């Protein structure tokens, strides 16, 4: 729970029962595991309450990247169908052309 509890429920159920969504969740989880120590996939699956600002932002970030890329897999520009619902980082990735790498290390900080 906390902020993005629904993002975590939806993200877990989608990770289990959708291979594209799961592929993107893994793709982001490796990147955060490179930029940080922990793993976002652990946090999503282990549906624990999260009041930490950074880890919540990272969870919502990965969930939105995977949902947006799942929509893109069905042939729609993600910023055109859920652009208003994106966080600063996911929107920076889908609308600002920011690389997933720079986005991941942008939400981590730590500075």
Residue numbers in the entry: 717 to 827
Task: Give sentences from the paper.
Recently, powerful evidence has verified that Pks13 is an essential enzyme in the mycolic acid biosynthesis pathway, and Pks13 has been extensively studied as a drug target for TB. The type-1 polyketide synthase enzyme Pks13 consists of five domains. The meromycoloyl chain on the N-ACP domain is transferred to the KS domain, and the intermediate product α-alkyl β-ketothioester is produced by a Claisen-type condensation reaction with another substrate, the carboxyacyl-CoA loaded by the AT domain.
We have determined the 2.59 Å high-resolution crystal structure of a partial AT domain from the M. tuberculosis Pks13 protein. These results indicated that the crystallized protein was actually proteolyzed to become a fragment (Ala717 to Arg826). The crystallized core motif ranging from Leu717 to Arg826 represents approximately one-third of the AT domain, and the overall crystal structure displays a fold similar to the reported AT domain. Although sequence alignment showed 100% identity between the core motif and the AT domain, the secondary structure elements presented a slight conformational change from residues Ala796 to Ser801, for which refinement indicated two η turns instead of the β strand highlighted by red dashed square line. In our work, the topographic conformation of Ala796 to Ser801 was transformed into two relatively disordered η turns, along with the conformational change of the position of Ser801 dislocating from the substrate. Furthermore, the side chain of the binding site Arg826 was also stretched to the reverse side of α5 and lost its interaction with Gln773. The nucleophilic elbow of α10 and β5 also transformed from an electropositive state to an electronegative state which indicates an unsuitable state to absorb a substrate. In summary, the conformational change of residues from Ala796 to Ser801 and the rearrangement of residues Gln773, Ser801, and Arg826 might all suggest that the degraded fragment formed a unique crystal packing state to survive proteolysis.
